[PDB]
Design a protein around this ligand. Structure first.
Ligand SMILES: Nc1nc2c(ncn2[C@@H]2O[C@H](COP(=O)(O)OP(=O)(O)OP(=O)(O)O)[C@@H](O)[C@H]2O)c(=O)[nH]1
Ligand SMILES: [Mg+2]
Ligand code: NA
Length: 344
């Protein structure tokens, strides 16, 4: 039932500078990419999108309202594309239920695209491809934040032909890597063929189509049990000292529910850590966990979400550690053993 709905996790993967973060900024209406050193992402990011927002941002490709939204929302995990962060792509990939693979339409598949495809294939993750930077097609005429088809229909013949040529090349490339793919509105087998959705992070065109498609992936490809909450599952992303809270952990809550005051167990350098949540915090909706802000204090947070936890004794917490909650009925040492076993 609806009071037990789970917000799924989507990872965005792709080669360096293909526009992962720029796409998320266009959706959030933020400017994270401009603040990044080097213009590159160097850590895992997480942003929560309430379904009310996704409905608004897909309205132009859902004008009558026939599309049925079932998810309460979606957590999207941003990852680096730079060669040196494979550990982070592997982590993000292992957390997600679905994914967006970003491909620069002007370049096609590149080395970390291929790395990413290996990850998606290994976990059999449902994904869609954002064929990004369509505004670089020579003579592209934009309508800001339009659906791709509406905009494509208005282009001159030369632009349409250049588009089709590049799409055909990118399809042949996916085929060579063992994936069949179709332009999204030509895909007759959403269950087995990858949908390609042309986008521009600069003009916003196609982003409504991409958001609709990732909801569809959650609702029509992700295992249906993952639409509802079950046993708590959570992963430590980072251990960071924060002004006025001391040593905190950033955590991806993958399943279940966290509560203020909860007593939690996780791996530490010198052994398991057992402590109490003094503050259970999130960013504002549609704002990055990897960005400093005023944080929202919660008594309760439901999965999936990226959270920050303040608790004594977090020094020595180990990034990548699983995290568990000691409930009214629990035996602790068992839990310690299984997180310690999963760490190794
Ligand atoms: N013309 C055009 N440029 C884009 C588009 N999307 C991204 N860019 C440019 O591409 C550059 C790289 O964008 P990023 O958002 O850093 O891409 P990324 O995939 O997140 O990069 P890494 O996280 O460093 O792997 C920036 O200069 C963007 O402004 C697009 O749709 N059109
Ligand atoms: Mg980035
Ligand atoms: Na970049």
């Amino acid at each position: 039932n609806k009071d037990n709905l789970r917000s799924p996790i989507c990872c965005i993967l792709g080669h360096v500078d293909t526009g992962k973060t720029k796409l998320l900024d266009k959706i959030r209406q933020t400017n994270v990419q401009e603040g990044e050193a080097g213009g590159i992402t160097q850590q895992i990011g997480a942003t929560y999108f309430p379904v009310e927002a996704i409905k608004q941002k897909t309205a132009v490709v859902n004008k009558d309202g026939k599309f049925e939204f079932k998810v309460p929302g979606l957590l999207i995990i941003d990852t680096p594309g730079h060669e040196s962060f494979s550990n982070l792509r592997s982590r993000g990939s292992s957390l997600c239920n679905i994914a967006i693979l970003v491909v620069d339409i002007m370049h096609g598949l590149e080395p970390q695209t291929i790395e990413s495809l290996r990850l998606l294939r290994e976990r059999k993750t449902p994904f869609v491809v954002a064929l990004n930077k369509i505004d670089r097609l020579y003579g592209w005429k934009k309508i800001e934040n339009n659906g791709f088809r509406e905009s494509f229909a208005l282009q001159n013949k030369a632009v349409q032909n250049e588009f089709r040529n590049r799409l055909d090349q990118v399809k042949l490339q996916f085929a060579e890597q063992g994936f069949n793919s179709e332009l999204f509105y030509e895909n007759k087998n959403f269950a087995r063929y990858v949908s390609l959705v042309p986008t521009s992070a600069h003009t916003g065109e196609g982003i409504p189509d991409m958001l609709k498609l990732i909801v569809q992936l959650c609702q029509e490809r992700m295992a249906s049990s993952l639409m509802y909450l079950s046993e708590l599952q959570a992963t430590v992303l980072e251990v960071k000292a924060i002004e006025g809270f001391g040593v905190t952990i950033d955590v991806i809550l993958s399943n279940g529910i966290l509560r203020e005051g909860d007593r939690i167990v996780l791996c530490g350098l010198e052994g398991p850590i057992k402590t109490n949540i003094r503050a259970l915090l999130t960013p504002a909706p549609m704002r990055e966990l990897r960005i400093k802000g005023q944080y929202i204090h919660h008594k309760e947070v439901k999965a999936a979400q990226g959270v920050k936890i303040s608790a004594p004794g977090l020094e020595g917490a180990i990034a990548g550690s699983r995290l568990l909650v000691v409930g009214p009925d629990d035996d602790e040492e068992e839990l310690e053993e299984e997180v310690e076993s999963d760490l190794q």
